[PDB]
């Protein structure tokens, strides 16, 4: 990963250092979400995990909610609600 300085391509280096750990390293769609959670970085998760066409598995997403509620990760509760999770089913 190169950080092009001048064309605002792939903006400030923090997103680069962290997004670098998400690309390659295939790992899952899930584990990508879990890693942002431990870091408490929703901007990464929203933009670089909840991408268009991201094929989501089965209630793995629910298992993320269970992890966010314990950890007191409020903004990941908000996000997962917006992106399909149901408290009634959960």
């Amino acid at each position: 990963t190169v950080f092009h300085i001048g064309s605002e391509d792939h903006q400030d280096i923090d997103v680069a250092i962290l997004t670098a750990l998400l690309k390659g390293t295939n790992a899952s769609a899930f584990d990508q979400l879990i890693l942002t959670l431990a870091w408490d970085r929703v901007d990464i998760a929203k933009n670089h995990v909840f991408v268009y066409g991201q094929q989501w598995l089965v209630g793995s997403l629910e298992q993320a909610m269970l992890d966010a509620l314990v950890m007191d990760r409020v903004s990941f509760v908000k996000l997962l609600i917006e992106n399909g999770v149901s408290m009634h089913k959960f």
Binding site: L57, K78, I81, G84, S86, K89
Partner: protein, 292 residues
């Protein structure tokens, strides 16, 4: 047979618990009873404007700046005029981006914006969890990966769903939208004003059947106008390109109909099967420029 599925299709909702309504009527219900339902039971007010949205299904990555202007612009026309936006309902294509535009510049102005969904009954994911009489229903907008089916858009307010041959069969909704558009235009816009309710059609990334839908309006009595916007990625941007090179009523400046037919088949592959025919449709659309 009895409609047997009418109530509240209240989406699970994300930030909110966005509500909605369903009736599941026939494919032969009369236009008088369709309207009668909307204002009597659902307690809707008569609109001073109708905006029908005909783009396509599966429209897939509207641009960044285009998203801002169309939304900000479309909400304003709707809230400032108390309008009914008519979409297809299915969360694929325009109905996605319309609901996206709502969410951006919401102002919870659903109070003043009554988006209505019209689709066939069967082509919709989780079809079976709605059957019943006056039933509050749950519904999951989970992007079920294996599902090639459609999902109803959470950011809508009403739904009318049209039976047909059966499940899978798609394209038996075109009549009801039109007959309703004729019906609303045959209502006076105010207790004091005699003119009928206007109808206008907006086009986002149209298509080889939409360019027949455009013509079908300009042939209509009265001739319903049409709006298009450039920056799209199918027929709207094309018929936008058709716009700049044409004179009033004229079919062509110095002949480029090979190059036009080249572009006609470039987007949707014809091979001069009927790419010529699509040109004479673009001909009659570049003709009546007093409504484009």
């Amino acid at each position: 047979s009895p409609t047997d599925a009418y109530g509240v299709i209240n989406f699970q909702g994300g930030s909110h618990s966005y509500r909605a309504k369903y009736v599941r009527l026939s494919y032969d219900t009369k236009p008088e009873i369709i309207l009668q339902l909307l204002l009597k039971e659902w307690q809707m007010e008569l609109p001073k404007l109708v905006i029908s949205v005909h783009g396509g299904m599966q429209k897939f990555e509207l641009h960044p700046r285009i998203k801002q202007l169309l939304g900000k612009g479309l909400i304003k026309a709707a809230v400032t005029t108390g309008a009914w936006i008519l979409t297809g309902g299915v969360n694929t294509g325009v109905a996605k981006h319309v609901g996206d535009a709502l969410k951006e510049h919401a102002s919870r102005s659903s109070r003043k914006i009554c988006t209505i969904g019209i689709a066939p009954w069967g082509v919709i994911e989780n079809r079976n969890d709605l059957v019943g009489r006056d039933v509050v229903a749950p519904y999951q907008t989970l992007l079920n990966p294996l599902s090639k089916l459609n999902v109803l858009n959470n950011l809508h307010s009403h739904f009318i769903l049209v039976d047909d041959g059966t499940v899978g069969k798609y394209g038996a909704e075109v009549r009801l939208r039109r007959e309703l558009e004729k019906t609303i235009n045959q209502q006076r816009i105010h207790a004091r004003i005699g003119q009928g309710v206007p109808v206008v059609a907006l086009i986002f990334e149209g298509g080889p059947n939409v360019i027949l839908t455009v013509l079908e309006y300009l042939q209509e009595s009265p001739p319903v106008p049409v709006v298009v916007c450039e920056g799209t990625g199918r027929a709207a941007d094309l018929l936008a390109y058709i716009h700049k090179q044409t004179e009033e009523g004229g079919n062509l400046p110095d002949a480029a109909e090979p190059d036009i037919i080249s572009t006609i088949k470039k987007t949707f592959n014809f091979g001069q099967s009927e790419a010529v025919h699509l040109f004479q449709t673009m001909m009659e659309c570049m003709k009546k420029k007093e409504l484009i």
